[PDB]
Design a protein around this ligand. Sequence first.
Ligand code: ADP
Ligand code: MG
Lengths: 188, 207
Amino acid sequence: YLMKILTERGYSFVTTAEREIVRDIKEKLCYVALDFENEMATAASSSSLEKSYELPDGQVITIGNERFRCPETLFQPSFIGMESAGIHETTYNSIMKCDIDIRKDLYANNVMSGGTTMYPGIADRMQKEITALAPSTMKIKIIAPPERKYSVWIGGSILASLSTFQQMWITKQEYDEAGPSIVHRKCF
Amino acid sequence: GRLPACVVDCGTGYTKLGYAGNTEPQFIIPSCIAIKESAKVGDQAQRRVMKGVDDLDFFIGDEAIEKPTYATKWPIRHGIVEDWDLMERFMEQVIFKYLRAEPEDHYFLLTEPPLNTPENREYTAEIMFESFNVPGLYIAVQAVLALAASWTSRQVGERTLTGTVIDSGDGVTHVIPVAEGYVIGSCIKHIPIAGRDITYFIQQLLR
Ligand SMILES: Nc1ncnc2c1ncn2[C@@H]1O[C@H](COP(=O)(O)OP(=O)(O)O)[C@@H](O)[C@H]1O
Ligand SMILES: [Mg+2]
């Protein structure tokens, strides 16, 4: 989507090398917007939001509304044409499908991880959206550790270090015996 | 009309089974044992703890191979055994279903590899005397049984006690000499390679 919009601005990128270039650009100069309409209006007064990036060839590209447009696709999947809902709606549906009593605990604890959730202000927007959707009688807290990129690896290392897990492994005697249908039964 | 005793030759591979005073081991089945285990994760503080009667909900023998929803888990590994609860379950299943012998009025002889540690024999004997309440028990190395069976080769009437036996096994093959009934204790060696790792190599090359 970022490539498609960068085309609408006037900059074209098709091949995979420019795909990596745009990936870096997004990694460096993208952020989420608390209010979409207010940000668009302030963009109408485009004198303090535009930023410049230096390409390998030396060309300079000026990026304005695209900084806070592409991340909004997460909350508005309709931009790409997908008939689904945003992350906030999906999390609300998942928590609602759970039992009533555990809903309080789930609201009180919301862990997030992955490389797509490092955009500044994402936690605040998610908190605001969840509180607006959820009843306004309790407290909703968002926890955003600054090392969520490698959280999965750290958890795997800690789990491996656990003494009790030294026996849950799957050995080769196992496989000597049957097609790996054994991965599922167990080891899950 | 005294009842015959019971003869069992347990081991890593196909476990021989049958009664004494007979010329053919009636039952020869693998050591494969089923269990209703699945995927819990808490498996080192409650190995199984099957609720209700699900604990005994497991098959045994050749019928246990064709059950594709449990786990085929061999209890024995070249003599030494890690968990012996499966062994006890197999023993009760065999004695009741297959042999149909009452332990309190029968004598059981068991065979173990020569390298079996004293602890395993002591604890299995304790388990037998406690649960099965067998009036009598006896455990001996399998070499002498092989020597006695070897008499049938030729000239049974001609007593020949001397010799030596190199027996095979699913995970062990041992060497034991006999000197007119009395074997030598220090002249015994244990070979780890056996008829199982051979098949492992075969399949590894074939793959
Ligand atoms: N005719 C055969 N040809 C090749 N291998 C055999 C043959 N019969 C048995 N075996 C092998 O010998 C092993 C069984 O030997 P055995 O001593 O009866 O097991 P255990 O040690 O439990 O008594 C099997 O694993 C099998 O692979
Ligand atoms: Mg053997």
